[PDB]
C-alpha cells in the first residue's frame, strides 16, 4: 500500500531513479487513524512479527499525570483546543501526540482536598496529623487554581493514540503553560 521506500524519490542530485522492485510487505504503511472524541472504540491491528498494535479510533478517557505532586488519575477529556502539526486537527477535535486538550479538574481536586485539605478558588485524628505533617507543599502557581476555578485544566498528550491505543499525558506547568497560553491568546 503506502510504500515508505527511499528508492521511489529522487536522489541527492535530483535525478529520477528508475523503478527497481515491486512494493514489499516489510516496508508497508497504513492509513492513519484520525482519532476523535467519542465512545471507546479501539481496533486491533496485526503487525510484522508475532506482535499486535492497538488503533484508537474513538476514545474519551485518559491517565493524565501531574508533574509536581507525582500523581496520575484517570480523567475524562473534554475537547482539543490547540495542536502543533496542523490547525485543522483542532477543528475536528483530534487526539494525537502533543495535541492539547482541556481536561476537567474534578478528580485531581477531589484527591487534593483529601491530601492537602485546603479548598481552592473563592476530622479523623490521623488525617489532620498528616495535614500538619505537610505544610510547605501547598503552594502552586496562580494559573493552576485559576484553571481550577473553572474546573478545566490544560494538558498535553504524550502517548501516541495510533500505536498504543491510549491517550495519556501530563498537565501543563507554568513555563510550558505560560508560553502556550500566550500563543493561545495570540491566536484568540
Amino acid at each position: 500500500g503506502i510504500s515508505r521506500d527511499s528508492r521511489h524519490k529522487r536522489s541527492a542530485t535530483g535525478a529520477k531513479r528508475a523503478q527497481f522492485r515491486k512494493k514489499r510487505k516489510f516496508e508497508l504503511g497504513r492509513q492513519p487513524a484520525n482519532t476523535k472524541i467519542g465512545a471507546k472504540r479501539i481496533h486491533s491491528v496485526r503487525t510484522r512479527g508475532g506482535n499486535k498494535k492497538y488503533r484508537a479510533l474513538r476514545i474519551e478517557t485518559g491517565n493524565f499525570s501531574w508533574a509536581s505532586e507525582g500523581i496520575s488519575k484517570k480523567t475524562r477529556i473534554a475537547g482539543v483546543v490547540y495542536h502543533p502539526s496542523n490547525n485543522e486537527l483542532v477543528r475536528t477535535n483530534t487526539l494525537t501526540k502533543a495535541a492539547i486538550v482541556q481536561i476537567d479538574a474534578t478528580p485531581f481536586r477531589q484527591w487534593f482536598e483529601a491530601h492537602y485539605g485546603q479548598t481552592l478558588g473563592k476530622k479523623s485524628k490521623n488525617a489532620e496529623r498528616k495535614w500538619a505533617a505537610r505544610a510547605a507543599s501547598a503552594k502552586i502557581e496562580s494559573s493552576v487554581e485559576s484553571q481550577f476555578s473553572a474546573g478545566r485544566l490544560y494538558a498535553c498528550i504524550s502517548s501516541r493514540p495510533g500505536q498504543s491505543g491510549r491517550c495519556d499525558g501530563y498537565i501543563l506547568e507554568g513555563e510550558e503553560l505560560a508560553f502556550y497560553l500566550r500563543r493561545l491568546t495570540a491566536k484568540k
Binding site: A67, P84, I140
Partner: protein, 140 residues
C-alpha cells in the same frame, strides 16, 4: 530565540520542580561522546534544544569517523563538507584526484565557518542524505 519556533523546545524526560525553588530555572542534561572528544562548554551552559546534537540530544556516535573541509554553511543546522582524495588507476600506475560531498549535521555548540576543517562521526540516519554529525571543530 529559543521558543521562537512553533512547538515548545525541551530536552525529553527532564523535569524542573516548581515546589523546590532552585537557582537555575532549567536543569540541563549532557553526555560525553567518547573517543576522547571533549564536550564544549557552550553545550553545558547553553540554552538551545536539539535532538540531533550529540551532546544534548538523543543521538549516539558510533562507526566510521571522518575529517573534511566545509564548503556550504548556508542552511539550517546542517553543513556540507568536502573530502578530496586520490584514486589509483592501476593501468597507468598513477592517481586521479576525486572528491565527495557529504552533508553533515551540526549542533549550535559549534561556530563553523566555511574554510575550517571539522571532524565528523557517523550516527543514525538523521535525514534523507544526512547520516553524519560534527563532533570537533578546528579553526583555519
Amino acid at each position: 530565540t529559543v521558543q521562537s519556533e512553533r512547538a515548545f523546545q525541551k530536552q525529553p524526560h527532564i523535569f524542573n520542580n516548581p515546589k523546590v525553588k532552585t537557582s537555575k530555572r532549567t536543569k540541563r542534561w549532557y553526555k560525553n561522546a567518547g573517543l576522547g572528544f571533549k564536550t564544549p562548554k557552550t553545550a553545558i551552559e547553553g540554552s538551545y534544544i536539539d535532538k540531533k546534537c550529540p551532546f544534548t540530544g538523543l543521538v549516539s556516535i558510533r562507526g566510521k569517523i571522518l575529517t573534511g573541509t566545509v564548503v556550504s554553511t548556508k542552511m539550517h543546522r546542517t553543513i556540507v563538507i568536502r573530502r578530496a582524495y586520490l584514486h589509483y588507476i592501476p593501468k597507468y600506475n598513477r592517481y586521479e584526484k576525486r572528491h565527495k560531498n557529504v552533508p553533515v549535521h551540526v549542533s549550535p555548540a559549534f561556530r563553523v565557518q566555511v574554510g575550517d576543517i571539522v571532524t565528523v562521526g557517523q550516527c543514525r540516519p538523521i535525514s534523507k542524505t544526512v547520516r553524519f554529525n560534527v563532533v570537533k571543530v578546528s579553526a583555519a
